[PDB]
Write a protein that binds this ligand. Sequence first.
Ligand SMILES: O[C@@H]1[C@@H](O)[C@H]2OC[C@H]3O[C@H](OC[C@H]4O[C@H](OC[C@H]5O[C@H](OC[C@H]6O[C@H](OC[C@H]7O[C@H](OC[C@H]8O[C@H](OC[C@H]9O[C@H](OC[C@@H](O2)[C@H]1O)[C@H](O)[C@@H](O)[C@@H]9O)[C@H](O)[C@@H](O)[C@@H]8O)[C@H](O)[C@@H](O)[C@@H]7O)[C@H](O)[C@@H](O)[C@@H]6O)[C@H](O)[C@@H](O)[C@@H]5O)[C@H](O)[C@@H](O)[C@@H]4O)[C@H](O)[C@@H](O)[C@@H]3O
Ligand SMILES: O[C@@H]1[C@@H](O)[C@H]2OC[C@H]3O[C@H](OC[C@H]4O[C@H](OC[C@H]5O[C@H](OC[C@H]6O[C@H](OC[C@H]7O[C@H](OC[C@H]8O[C@H](OC[C@H]9O[C@H](OC[C@@H](O2)[C@H]1O)[C@H](O)[C@@H](O)[C@@H]9O)[C@H](O)[C@@H](O)[C@@H]8O)[C@H](O)[C@@H](O)[C@@H]7O)[C@H](O)[C@@H](O)[C@@H]6O)[C@H](O)[C@@H](O)[C@@H]5O)[C@H](O)[C@@H](O)[C@@H]4O)[C@H](O)[C@@H](O)[C@@H]3O
Ligand SMILES: [Ca+2]
Ligand code: NA
Length: 700
Amino acid sequence: GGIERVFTDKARYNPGDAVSIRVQAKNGTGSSWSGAARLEIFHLENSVYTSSQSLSLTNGQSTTLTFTWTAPSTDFRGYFVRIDAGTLGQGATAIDVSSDFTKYPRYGYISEFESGETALESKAKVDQLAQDYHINAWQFYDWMWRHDKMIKRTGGSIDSTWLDLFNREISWSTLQNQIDAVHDVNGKAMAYAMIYASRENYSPLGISPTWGIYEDSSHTNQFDVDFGDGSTYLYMFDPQNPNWQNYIHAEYIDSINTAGFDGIHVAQMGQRSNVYDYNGNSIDLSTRFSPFLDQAKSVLSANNPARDNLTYNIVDGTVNGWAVNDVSKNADLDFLYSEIWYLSDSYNQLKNYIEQLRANGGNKAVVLAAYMNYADNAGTRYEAESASMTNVSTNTNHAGYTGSGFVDQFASTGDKVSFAINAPEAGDYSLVFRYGNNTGANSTLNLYVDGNFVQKLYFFNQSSWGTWKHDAWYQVPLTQGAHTVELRYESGNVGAVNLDSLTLGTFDEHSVRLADAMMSASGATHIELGDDNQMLPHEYYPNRSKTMRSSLKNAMKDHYNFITAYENLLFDSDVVPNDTGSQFVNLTGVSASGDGSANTVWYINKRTSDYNIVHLINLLGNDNQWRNTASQPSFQTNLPAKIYIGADETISDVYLASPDLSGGETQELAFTSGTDAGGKYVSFTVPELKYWNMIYMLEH
Ligand SMILES: O[C@@H]1[C@@H](O)[C@H]2OC[C@H]3O[C@H](OC[C@H]4O[C@H](OC[C@H]5O[C@H](OC[C@H]6O[C@H](OC[C@H]7O[C@H](OC[C@H]8O[C@H](OC[C@H]9O[C@H](OC[C@@H](O2)[C@H]1O)[C@H](O)[C@@H](O)[C@@H]9O)[C@H](O)[C@@H](O)[C@@H]8O)[C@H](O)[C@@H](O)[C@@H]7O)[C@H](O)[C@@H](O)[C@@H]6O)[C@H](O)[C@@H](O)[C@@H]5O)[C@H](O)[C@@H](O)[C@@H]4O)[C@H](O)[C@@H](O)[C@@H]3O
Ligand SMILES: O[C@@H]1[C@@H](O)[C@H]2OC[C@H]3O[C@H](OC[C@H]4O[C@H](OC[C@H]5O[C@H](OC[C@H]6O[C@H](OC[C@H]7O[C@H](OC[C@H]8O[C@H](OC[C@H]9O[C@H](OC[C@@H](O2)[C@H]1O)[C@H](O)[C@@H](O)[C@@H]9O)[C@H](O)[C@@H](O)[C@@H]8O)[C@H](O)[C@@H](O)[C@@H]7O)[C@H](O)[C@@H](O)[C@@H]6O)[C@H](O)[C@@H](O)[C@@H]5O)[C@H](O)[C@@H](O)[C@@H]4O)[C@H](O)[C@@H](O)[C@@H]3O
Ligand SMILES: [Ca+2]
Ligand code: NA
């Protein structure tokens, strides 16, 4: 109804802090409305607070109510917030009372630092992530001038702007305003920094090649990253080297003390093998990160124990993967972080990996980078062969295209392809072109939207006309309704392309919801939101090649309310797998599985001292792969469940909460206790299963 927003002023609260709960209400009923707005706050099954205010609104008028609440004294507790305004409608949010974000991290990012961004605008984008998703830490991505010289100075003076490695202008005042805004919501700012990277031409900085790591035993070929312009490179160094540690840890401290960061997000490039030090000693790089990290933590904590937060990216996460055991078991990190590539493609394989990190780390929190739909040209597609084209024609003579063909020889001034699209709602749209190019170099075309020039786009060379890509994209704001998107070959464009299609790059809500459910039911969170409410499509965080539509935004608001409100049941140290015992889940009238099998309801059994926890994740109508696009699950109603429990257990009450249902509010279910040949059991009916239900059963 007319409850438009419910939220709090900060993302996280210390015990005893005042919480301002805001309620944005609008009357759109027809005539005047009078009544009460009732607040109820729950901790898991138990109500802990109520209050009410009268609310009278003429038709069409709006107001924001404020309810004040003192964060209760027990540290590390999540709460669900219900606002009930009768026939005007209802709303919800969640509250996290934690003195330390690293126990329950909800990790977002900032990757854009434009000088034109005002203090107000910096505050707005941070507030929005804080308010909508309770984001409590932000990874500041590519804020630094050089990987080995993070704050650019002229003599003793900090430069007001600098150009990053991709020639983006970074504004100091904008960065500082964002950090301030993060702190204002009780958030923490984590500075991206590599564990072992310099930029090119590092000698004049006092960095020695003798600290480096090499691909050969004669120190002639230093490990590097080559960005493809003959100018911009990273060079790699030995994390165990005392001089490299001295140098880069000094950079970390400079970043903390000068820029006001609260910690370092330590990064790497992932597996590199057959590594040597300068002197030609063969070295296993995978075990060299933990001594570096232990020492980084030491110097950080000595400098400022309130700004000493530390994590490290375990790149290419999978069970027993590269550096997985050494870092997770041995590194002095506050929480664990891992970027998943292609070694944990199934839901169950990824679950197993999260569980290994949790076990190895002593139940430290686990955050995953896991770019949704990364490989997919996901979204509404307009085939180029069905568009309106001038001076080019269609063809079918290169395999790989989608639809009935493609537009070919898009190669001369006057050539045009015009797409008639529809924006179903006002917002940003990612314009993604699928194309071919085997001209021997880059090709270009000019992008126009509704008759206006927007950008020259680059279309990269492939060694075959049979090789298609969809990495030519540009994001634009569109009003709701019809629009025209044109590519034109004009005076100044070069080469040629074959054009397959235009796609409105869009994150698939179904896969994104199921992945987030699987991750948090398994005991991890997911770095996926940042900047001005952008979802993360790619490892280069400024990438805007897909966008979220409002439906997914709303589901993420519900999801983040859920993993905040129920953080105790999802992420606590005592929340452990319950596959170790005599117990079983039985669902009537659906195929079920304990290993995330395709086209089943997937059950996951957890426990604490006080609760027997069963997650139901609905894979009916979908495959067992976490990353790819999915269909809407086959939603279920009145699903009978029978759960076997230990002879030791008696259940007081059965509860079910779902982000999909009433905003995550817990419903108590009637249940029957019984014992048969199979064992002691409990049974009940699940009223609804859409994507994800968490059943939690209180022990007597
Ligand atoms: O400031 C930022 C910089 O610090 C830097 O950050 C990069 C990201 O760092 C993290 O992600 C790490 C990494 O994860 C995955 O790789 C893990 C993978 O590594 C091995 O496989 C290597 C490689 O094999 C194949 O290519 C062969 C190719 O490999 C080397 O070149 C690698 C690429 O180097 C250049 O591009 C670098 C970088 O540029 C952009 O990112 C900018 C940021 O860089 C910057 O903001 C791109 O967006 C990004 O995609 C790209 O990595 C070249 O321009 C590019 O062409 C190369 O591919 C080698 O040097 C070269 O000689 C070889 O020819 C394979 O095709 C390729 O996909 C794979 O990466 C190891 O064997 C595997 O086991 C292991 O799984 C990703 O694949 C990789 O892209 C990521 O960089 C952070 O988490 C990210 O947020 C950072 O963006
Ligand atoms: O089945 C066959 C098709 O696959 C296709 O094969 C093309 C060639 O493939 C191999 O060589 C790969 C090689 O190509 C280029 O160098 C060779 C090139 O050199 C001269 O042209 C120099 C010219 O190069 C660049 O422009 C190229 C091209 O761009 C526009 O067209 C794009 C379309 O190209 C193809 O169709 C047009 C094609 O049609 C006939 O060839 C049929 C074969 O094509 C077919 O059997 C013509 O004889 C040929 O001249 C013409 O290109 C694709 O099929 C279509 O999908 C693409 O849209 C442009 O309109 C056109 O005029 C250009 O020729 C560069 O941009 C430009 O500046 C430069 O001047 C020589 O005159 C050409 O005849 C020759 O092809 C790349 O430069 C190089 O990097 C690649 O590795 C075979 O070995 C060749 O035998 C094939 O011709
Ligand atoms: Ca096509
Ligand atoms: Na899938």
